[PDB]
Write a protein of this length. Structure first.
Lengths: 447, 344, 236, 53
């Protein structure tokens, strides 16, 4: 190119085979001269620690810790963007891990964080919720540019995946998971990539259920409870821990389903090691995009796995979970007229989904949902939107409607309904039968 | 360690539980399975006898007993009812809940409805209703009136729930199979609870129940052992609002004969004794009773663990009650206060 | 006294009294179970995890009426910390700076300083020499790598930034002075120049705190420098 | 007396079994973090100076 097709990709793949090991000079890099530049003096202006101002109605002070000094270390977990884990240091000599994303517009994720804060304020304003004192835990994300953004690190947590793995014989887990992965579910319901369309095309209820049975027998149980007891110190402490954690988990599930957040893998959820508080991550997928913008199945409303049921014996997801859902949705029966003013900041970053139709259609779906809707109806219409031409699409909307009587009967609680009807439909018709029949391997139903 | 054990009961119970668990974990190394089963059986007899024999329910003691029991599956065969009653009275709801849940799980419709309803009453005590739905929605709410009254109370109303209980206990032609005694007892407890909630005197004399089924003398059955505080609170409320029967007073006097009934009366109702003797204006014994109740309460709270916050909150209303009555007695007349104007 | 206390509590009413009480009161300090001890017997050696008593005893040892009870508690805590410190050695420790006991340091150390800087001089005289010995231990060359960091950081933040307990602040300052002096004595210049635990790190911390907007940080840094001055004037 | 010492030692030591620590390790801690799987030993009338095939 002395001046401006497939030849572009042919050129790109040349460097694509030797690339992508970003090691700056030492852990204390010099890609930032600041790493050793402008220690606190009048040589420059003091740099505030990112995102440390939180508008709470009061003009914030300014004595807050600002970026000064560094003990920098670089670790790049090989994720989709291969994010960079960095240590920012303020003048208080306080460590700060920040997760440096690559090229992305976190403006949408910034809206997500704002909405999280708004709904937390709503929970505070709700009578029964504040009585039970439910609250979401968030964190700071800052989009640097359109092609650059930065987020915070939680500083004490672990993925639920590893947290389950380490609380049991990890050799057994690896052996008896790695052995059946594609056969048990992704092959032994039709028999590879693309063959999932035939899978769900050829899926039938009996092989559906039997496949799920093989999946559940594949994996051990109570690993969540093992983690609880390992983390607990007294029985009552364990009870309070499990109750609080389950309530927080339910709140996350309902919130991100309302937002239609795409959380397939287990690693969408990080759990703190102090309060056992699970927190969701990896945003950008919203409004059922994975259903529409992706061919992979995203019919499930949230992550509700076998261990989430084995969380303890007497629980049936119709106790505390049911009530949490009830209180949340009751607190959400007046928020639309409010919250519709929110996810339409201007039009809320138009065509963001197209670069990651109209977002107005998505917000119409959302407000229709919050005003009362059948989740099966939402799934069917979202599948029709920009995904109807796909093969086995009639099968997809059928399993969204559900096959069995205990799945078809969700048609009655439809298009405006009680909170409890909507949540019971979510937990019943949207959670089990789809994962039984049409599920994504990365969603990892077995675990 | 031996020094502090007699000092702090909490440290004592932690140490005792730990050493007990270690000893049990060790005995297997040199014992046959039958020997372990025999020893376990003996321990279960001992513990059930303990639960059935204690009247004072020492929070640390009963908590340690329940914890040690839940340490080992072999202990899960214990009597649920007495444990539930004690942990209820001794504010040990969470530890009892955990114990009963672990016993149910290890034991895997089955008569677990016994332990089911015991857990249900435990959650009702802590005001927890949400699990109860899930408890009875599967197979346990054999009488759906139970679930209906549960959700009716969940919305902070009791009158409709009170009717539910009254008709359920008066529902006898159970085409669905007659309930166990446990469910009816639960209905009785719920009726008493809502009558207290309907603190209006009409529901208070409902709470009197007129001693249904024709029943110290009127407290000996363990059901009546549980009902007695409700009975006396109702009668005392009636007397304070203006009733004069003295029958409750005579019952108290008879309870003075024999210490155990008396002993537990000062153990849990010394305030009520003070108020009663204030009704007859016998200020001296009322003052002594309130002093004793204050000491009992304060040592109780000192015996309460920290993380059981809600337990402490439930303890804390007694502070205001005893303080109000203490202010009253300490301001009865100490200079001829009635002749003075001290609206302080 | 207790009678008048409960009298006050009832006088204030519930809406006030509930101010007595989210980390939600507990974290179960160690993710693991350790601090084991096999109680001796002629027939068996039952093992006991001493750690379970730490959160309780500390609260008893730190806060208690009944001078007899509090003294028993503090003596027993001294014994357990002695035992745990001894158990620190002979440990496979290739996963953390102090895997078999790291969090216990975090829990204990503030309590240790409070117990070594408090009233009832019996506790003072049984703890202050003990904490000096602890300094001389966790200033060793072997004891100079990521576990001394915990005690150092605590002995910084404890009083040097603290609203209350002036004698605590002064005591922790003198502890810092003694600690740095002992580090100078025992340790080769090689480690001090290599290990970040040295006078320059302390200088940076002090400059930060004095710059940091708060009376407590700046006052602690000032007084700590005043303490260290007596020996630091003797360094060229 | 040819074996007297051996017999005295046996009478003094094979009795020492009731000590609870007697079947227990002198050190309940690994030398460091590692994995110590079972290792056996094979005994036979087969020795060196035997094999060249």
């Amino acid at each position: 190119f002395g001046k401006g097709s497939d030849f572009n990709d042919i050129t790109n793949m040349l460097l694509l085979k030797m690339n992508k090991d970003s090691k700056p000079p030492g852990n204390l890099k010099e890609c930032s001269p600041w790493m050793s530049d402008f220690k606190v003096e009048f040589l420059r202006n003091e740099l505030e620690i990112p995102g440390q101002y939180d508008g709470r109605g009061k003009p914030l002070p300014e004595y807050h810790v600002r970026i000064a000094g560094f003990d920098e270390r670089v670790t790049v977990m090989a994720s989709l963007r291969r994010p960079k884990r960095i240590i920012i240091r303020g003048h208080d000599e306080r460590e700060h891990p920040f997760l440096v994303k690559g090229g992305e517009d976190l403006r949408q994720d910034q809206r997500v964080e704002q909405l999280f804060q708004v709904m937390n304020g709503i929970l505070a304003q709700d009578s029964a919720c504040s009585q039970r004192a439910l609250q979401l835990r968030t964190y700071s994300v800052v989009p640097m540019t359109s092609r650059l953004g930065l987020i915070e690190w939680l500083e004490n947590t672990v993925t639920l995946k590893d947290l389950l793995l380490n609380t049991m014989s990890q050799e057994e887990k690896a052996a008896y998971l790695s052995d059946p992965r594609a056969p048990p579910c992704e092959y032994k319901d039709w028999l590879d990539v693309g063959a999932y369309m035939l899978m769900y095309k050829g899926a039938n209820r009996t092989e559906t259920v039997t496949s799920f049975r093989k999946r559940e027998s594949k994996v051990p149980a109570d690993l969540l409870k093992r983690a609880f007891v390992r983390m607990s110190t007294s029985p009552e402490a364990f009870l309070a821990l499990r109750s609080h954690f389950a309530s927080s988990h339910a709140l996350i599930c309902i919130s991100h389903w309302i937002l239609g957040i795409g959380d397939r893998h287990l690693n969408n959820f990080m759990v703190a090691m102090e309060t056992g508080g699970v927190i969701g991550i990896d945003f950008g997928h919203a409004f059922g995009s994975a259903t529409q913008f992706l061919p992979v199945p995203e019919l499930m409303p949230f992550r509700l796995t076998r261990q989430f049921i084995n969380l303890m014996l007497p629980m049936k997801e119709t106790g505390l979970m049911y009530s949490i859902m009830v209180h949340a949705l009751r607190a959400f029966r007046s928020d639309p007229g409010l919250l519709t003013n929110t996810m339409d900041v201007f039009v809320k970053e138009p065509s963001f989904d197209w670069k990651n139709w109209y977002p107005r259609q998505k917000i119409c779906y959302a407000k229709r949902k919050l005003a009362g809707a059948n989740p099966a109806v939402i799934t069917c219409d979202e599948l029709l939107l920009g995904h109807e031409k796909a093969p086995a699409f009639r099968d997809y909307v059928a399993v969204a409607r559900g096959s069995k009587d205990h799945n078809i009967r969700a048609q009655e609680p439809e298009s405006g309904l009680s909170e409890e009807t909507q949540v019971k439909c979510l937990m019943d018709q949207a959670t089990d039968p789809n994962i039984l029949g049409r599920t994504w391997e990365g969603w990892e139903p077995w675990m | 360690l031996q020094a502090v054990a007699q000092r702090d009961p909490i440290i004592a119970k932690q140490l005792f539980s730990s050493l007990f668990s270690g000893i049990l974990k060790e005995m297997d190394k040199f014992k046959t399975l039958s020997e372990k089963n025999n020893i376990t059986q003996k321990l279960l007899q001992d513990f059930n006898r303990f639960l059935n024999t204690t009247f004072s329910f020492f929070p640390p003691f009963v908590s340690c007993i329940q914890d040690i029991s839940c340490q080992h599956a072999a202990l899960l065969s214990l009597d649920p009812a007495a444990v539930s009653a004690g942990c209820l009275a001794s504010l040990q709801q969470p530890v009892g809940i955990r114990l009963l849940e672990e016993a149910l799980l290890r034991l895997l419709l089955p008569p677990d409805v016994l332990r089911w309803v015991e857990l249900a009453k435990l959650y009702r005590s802590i005001g927890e209703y949400d699990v109860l739905r899930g408890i009875f929605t599967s197979e346990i709410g054999t009488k759906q009136i139970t679930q209906s009254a549960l959700l009716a109370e969940a919305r902070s109303d009791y009158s409709e729930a009170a009717k539910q209980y009254d008709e359920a206990l008066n529902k006898q032609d159970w085409v669905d199979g007659e309930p166990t005694e446990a469910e009816k007892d639960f209905w009785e407890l719920a009726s008493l609870d809502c009558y207290n909630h309907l603190a209006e005197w009409k529901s208070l004399e409902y709470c009197s129940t007129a001693s249904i089924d024709s029943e110290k003398i009127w407290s000996e059955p363990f059901y009546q052992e549980t009902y007695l505080p409700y009975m006396i609170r109702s009668k005392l409320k009636l007397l304070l609002q203006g009733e004069a029967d003295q029958s409750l007073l005579t019952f108290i006097d008879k309870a003075m004969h024999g210490e155990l009934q008396k002993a537990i009366l000062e153990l849990h109702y010394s305030q009520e004794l003070s108020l009663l003797y204030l009704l007859q204006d016998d200020v001296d014994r009322a003052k002594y009773y309130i002093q004793n109740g204050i000491q009992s309460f304060m040592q109780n709270y000192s015996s309460i663990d920290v993380l059981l916050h809600q337990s402490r909150l439930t303890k804390l209303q007694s502070v205001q009650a005893l303080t109000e009555i203490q202010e009253f007695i300490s301001f009865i007349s100490k200079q001829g206060n009635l002749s003075s104007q001290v609206p302080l | 006294i207790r009678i008048r206390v409960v009298q006050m509590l009832g006088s204030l009413g519930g809406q006030i009294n509930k101010n007595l009480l989210m980390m939600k009161s507990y974290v179960a300090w160690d993710r693991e179970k350790r601090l084991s001890f096999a109680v001796p017997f002629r027939e068996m050696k039952p093992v006991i995890f001493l750690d379970v008593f730490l959160p309780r005893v500390t609260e008893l040892a730190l806060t208690a009426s009944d001078r007899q009870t509090k003294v028993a508690a503090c003596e027993l805590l001294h014994s357990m910390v002695m035992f745990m410190l001894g158990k620190a050695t002979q440990m496979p420790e290739g996963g953390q700076g102090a895997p078999p006991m790291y969090q216990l340091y975090k829990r204990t150390f503030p309590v240790l300083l409070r117990l070594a800087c408090d009233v009832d001089q019996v506790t003072r005289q049984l703890y202050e020499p003990l904490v000096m010995q602890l300094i001389h231990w966790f200033t060793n060359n072997k004891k100079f790598e990521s576990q001394d960091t915990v005690a150092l950081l605590e002995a910084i933040l404890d009083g040097i930034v603290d609203p209350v307990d002036s004698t605590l602040r002064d005591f922790c300052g003198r502890c810092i002075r003694e600690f740095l002096k002992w580090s100078i004595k025992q340790i080769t210049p090689q480690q001090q120049e290599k290990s970040p635990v040295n006078t320059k790190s302390l200088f940076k911390r002090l400059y930060s705190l004095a710059l940091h907007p708060n009376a407590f940080k700046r006052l602690g840094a000032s007084l700590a420098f005043n303490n260290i001055y007596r020996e630091f004037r003797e360094e060229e | 007396e040819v074996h007297f010492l051996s017999l005295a030692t046996n009478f003094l030591l094979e009795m020492t079994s009731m000590s609870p620590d007697y079947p227990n390790p002198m050190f309940e801690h690994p030398l460091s973090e590692c994995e110590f799987q079972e290792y056996t030993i094979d005994s036979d009338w087969r020795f060196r100076s035997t094999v060249l095939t």
